[PDB]
Amino acid sequence: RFLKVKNWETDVVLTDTLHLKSTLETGCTEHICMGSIMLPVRTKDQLFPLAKEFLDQYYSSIKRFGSKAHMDRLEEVNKEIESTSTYQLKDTELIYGAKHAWRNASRCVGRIQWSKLQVFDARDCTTAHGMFNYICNHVKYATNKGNLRSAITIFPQRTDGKHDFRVWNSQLIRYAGYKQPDGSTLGDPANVQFTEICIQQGWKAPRGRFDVLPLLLQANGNDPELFQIPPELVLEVPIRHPKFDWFKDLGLKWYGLPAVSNMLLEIGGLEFSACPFSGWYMGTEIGVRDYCDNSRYNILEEVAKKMDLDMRKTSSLWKDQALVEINIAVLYSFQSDKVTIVDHHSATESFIKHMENEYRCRGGCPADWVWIVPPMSGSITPVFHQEMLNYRLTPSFEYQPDPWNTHVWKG
Amino acid sequence: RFLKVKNWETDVVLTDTLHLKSTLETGCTEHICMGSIMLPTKDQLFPLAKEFLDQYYSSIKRFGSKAHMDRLEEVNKEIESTSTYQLKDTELIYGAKHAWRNASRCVGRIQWSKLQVFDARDCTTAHGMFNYICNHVKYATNKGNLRSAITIFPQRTDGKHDFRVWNSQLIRYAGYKQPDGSTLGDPANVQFTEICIQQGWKAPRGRFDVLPLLLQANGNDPELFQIPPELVLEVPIRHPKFDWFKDLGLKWYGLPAVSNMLLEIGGLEFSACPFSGWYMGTEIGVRDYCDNSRYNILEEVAKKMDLDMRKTSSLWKDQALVEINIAVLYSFQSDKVTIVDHHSATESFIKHMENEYRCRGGCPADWVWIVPPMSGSITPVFHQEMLNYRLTPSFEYQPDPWNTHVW
Ligand code: HEM
Ligand code: HEM
Ligand SMILES: CN(C)c1cccc(CNCc2ccc3ccc(N)nc3c2)c1
Ligand SMILES: CN(C)c1cccc(CNCc2ccc3ccc(N)nc3c2)c1
Ligand SMILES: C[C@H](O)[C@H](O)[C@H]1CNc2nc(N)[nH]c(=O)c2N1
Ligand SMILES: C[C@H](O)[C@H](O)[C@H]1CNc2nc(N)[nH]c(=O)c2N1
Ligand SMILES: [Zn+2]
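Predict the joint structure of the above. Result:
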C-alpha cells in the first residue's frame, strides 16, 4: 500500500511506504480522528519479537542483514531473554536506538539534526548521586558555553517496574512556580506542583520569579533525592529587545538548554524510563508558549501596555503585535549572547527539506501537523501547506505517568 | 466509546457522546492519522431518508408520533415509486442549517441557526439560476450588514441533469498567465478564468477582475452571466497608520460565497447550493494576500515598512503579516462591512463548542482548520482538544465540473 502527500503551495507530491512498518496505534479510527488529542512489567512472550524486529532493523542499517554476526546476536539475545527475561543492548545498538527514536519523533520539527546526537551511556549508574554526576556532565557538554550540542544520557532500563530510574523533573532546567495565598502565581505556573514536591522534600526555595529548580532523582526504585545543579553550569540569557529599551526592564530571562527528562525511551522492547535529552530552542517555544500562554508567564498585556497599543478592541490585533515583538526579543537576546537558537522560519524550512530527504532515502517521514506547525505565523511557514502522515515507528520516545502518582514510598 | 476532550488552558473537560452517531468515514486508521490531508439506489436511499427523518422529528419533539410514522411511509412510498423523493420546506431548512452545524472545519458555527434558506428547487434554466444568485447576493450583502444565506437548486436525479455553479465562489478575481512568466491577478483562478475565455468571456485583463458566473442548469452546458457590478460590494484596503498602504492598490470583496460544494440531506444530493456568511479577517489578510500561491504581497509590504529582510530571524515576515491583517480589519470596519477578527471568532467558537456539548452531547471539530493561520496559540482554540468526525446532513466537496461534464 502506497500513500501520497501533497504540498499545496509547491504541488510537490511524495509517496510514503514507510508507514507499512508501523506497529503501535494512533488513537484514530475510521469513524473518528483524534489527531488533536494531546495524550492518546512486560513478558518474555512479547519481548523476543520486539528484540528481533529491532535487531533486524539495526543489522540492515549496517548492511549486515542475515550475516553470521546478525544470526549469532539474535541467538545470543534469545538465550539471554529466556534465561533472564530481558537483555542488554550493545553500545552500538543503544546509540542506533537513541538516534532512531529521535528520528521517529513525529512531533519534532528539529529532526534534520537526528544523526548528530551525543549518546551518554549511564547504564552503570546505581545511585541518585551517580545520576547527578552524569546529569551535570550532560549539561556541561550540551551547553558548551553557548554553542549547544544535542545529547542524551541513558540510565538503566526498567526491570520489574519496581526498580525504575526516574528523573522527577520534567526538564533538567526549569523555573520554580509558587502559588500565593491571593491566588496569583510567582514564577512559572507550569511548575507549581513540582515546586511543591521539592519544597516538601526539603528544598529551601528562594521564592523569586526565576528560581532554577533542584533535581529530584530516583535511582533503582528508591525514594528520590534532591540536588542543586551547580549555578555555573546553568547558562541563562537576559531578554532585551533591539529597538525597545524598556524591554529589558520587564526583568525577563530564560535558560539556554531545553532538556526534556520525563520521557520514556523504548528500544527493542526495552524500556529506559530515565533518558534526559537536550537540543536547542526554537524561539517560539520561549516567546510564544513560555512567555505568552495565559497559563504560563502571561506577559502579553504588560508588553502591550508598554508599546501603547490600542487594547480596547482585539480587532486592533494588539496581542499579535506584542507577540511578535516578544519573539523578536527572544531571538535577538540569544544571538547577541551567542547562545544557539533557531527561528521558526529557518526551522520549518529545514524540516521540509529533512522531510523530502526522508521520503527518498527511507520511504517516509511520520509527522504530526498539529505539533510541527509553529504556534505563531503558521501559514507563512512552509510546513502549513504540507500534508503529513502521522504514524508510530520504534524506537520511540513515549510519555509516562508522573512519578509522584505511581511511586511506592519507602520512607 | 465515551470520549473526553480537555482544554489545556482552562482544565475544562467535556464528554463527547455525539460521535456515536457518526456515519461517514474519516480517512484515518488505528495505524495512520490523516488529519492533515486536505481531501482524504433505492436501497441506499431509504435508510438515509429514515435516518434523517428520525432526527428531524426528534428535533421537533415528535419522535415516534403518528405524523412521524406517516411521513416515514409517505417517503418510503415515494422512493419505491419515483426512485427518489422530495423534502418538505421545513425539512429542507432543517437540513441546511444542520449541514452548517455539522461542518467540522467551520469556526463560525455559533451562527448556525441564523441561516436564511432560499428554496430554488423550482429553477429550470441557467437564466433562472442567475436571478436567484443575484437575489442571494443582494440579500446577504445587505449594504454591508452581512446576513448568512444559502440558495438551493434542484437535487441530483440521474447525475446527467446536474445543477452546478462552475465558479468556486460567487465572487472571485480572475487570473491570467503572462508571457513574462508571471501571473496577473489571483493565481488560484487561472484555469477557471481560461475556461471563461473559452466559453467567450471578454476579460479586462486586470488584477482584480470579478469573474462572471458559469451556470449549469439541468445538466445542460454552462452559460456566462455577469453579476451586476452594483451588487458586488468591495473594500479598498488602507492602513490606519501607514499612509503608503493604499498605494499597493489592494481591495477585496465583502461577500464570501462558497459555490462549489455538495449539500447532502437524507441521501439527496444538492450539487448546486451556494452559501455565504462573512469573512474572518485572516482569510483575506493571511491566506489571500500572503500565501505564495496567491497574491503573495509579503515582500512588497515588508519593503515599504523598511524592515531588515536579510535574515529570517528579524521576523520581518511576521511583522508585515500583522500589519496586513490590521489593515484588512480596519478597512472593512471603516466601510461598515461585517468582518470578524480571529480572536473574536475563536472565542465565539469555544462558547459554541461548550453549548453543543451541553445541548447536543458534542461538536465535531477539525483542529487543523479551526486554528487560525496566524497567532494560533494566543487564541483559545489552540489549547482545545477537538474530536473530528463526520455527521449528516453535510457539505462535501465534489469534482470540478469541467473534468466531468459531457460537452
Ligand atoms: C536540536 C534542536 C531541536 C529543536 C529545535 C527541536 C524542536 C522541537 C519542538 C519545537 C518540539 C515541539 C514541542 C513543543 O513545542 O512543545 C519538539 C518536540 C519533540 N522533540 Fe525536538 N527539537 C530538537 C532536538 C531534539 C532532540 C535532541 C530530541 C531527542 C533526542 C528531540 C525529541 C523530541 C521529541 C520526542 C518531541 C515530542 C515531544 C512531545 O511529544 O511532547 N528533539 N522538538
Ligand atoms: C457567518 C460567518 C462565517 C464565518 C466567520 C465562517 C468561518 C469559516 C472559516 C474561517 C473557515 C476556514 C476556511 C478556510 O480557511 O479556507 C470556514 C470553513 C467552512 N465553513 Fe464557515 N464561516 C461562516 C459562515 C458559514 C456558512 C453560512 C456556512 C454554510 C451554510 C459555512 C460552512 C462552512 C463549511 C462547510 C466550511 C469547510 C469548507 C471546507 O471544507 O473547505 N460557513 N468557515
Ligand atoms: C507541561 N508540559 C506540556 C511540558 C512539560 C515539560 C516539557 C515540555 C516541553 N516538551 C516538548 C518538547 C520536547 C522535546 C524538545 C526538544 C527540543 C526542543 N527545543 N524542544 C522540545 C520540546 C512540556
Ligand atoms: C477548491 N477549493 C479548495 C476552494 C475554492 C474556493 C474557495 C475555497 C474556500 N473554502 C473554505 C471556506 C468555506 C466556507 C466559508 C464560509 C465563510 C467564510 N468566511 N469562509 C469560508 C471558507 C476553497
Ligand atoms: C495541509 C493542510 O490540510 C492545509 O494546508 C490546510 C491547513 N489548515 C487550513 N485551515 C484553514 N482554515 N483553511 C485552509 O485552507 C487550511 N489549509
Ligand atoms: C490541543 C492540542 O493538542 C494542544 O494544545 C497542542 C497543540 N499543538 C502544540 N504544538 C506544540 N509544538 N506544542 C504544544 O504543546 C502543542 N499543544
Ligand atoms: Zn486522525
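Residues B 100, 103, 105-108, 111, 115, 148, 150, 275, 277-278, 280, 283, 340, 345, 369, 395 surround protoporphyrin IX containing FE (ligand 2) (CB under 6 Å).
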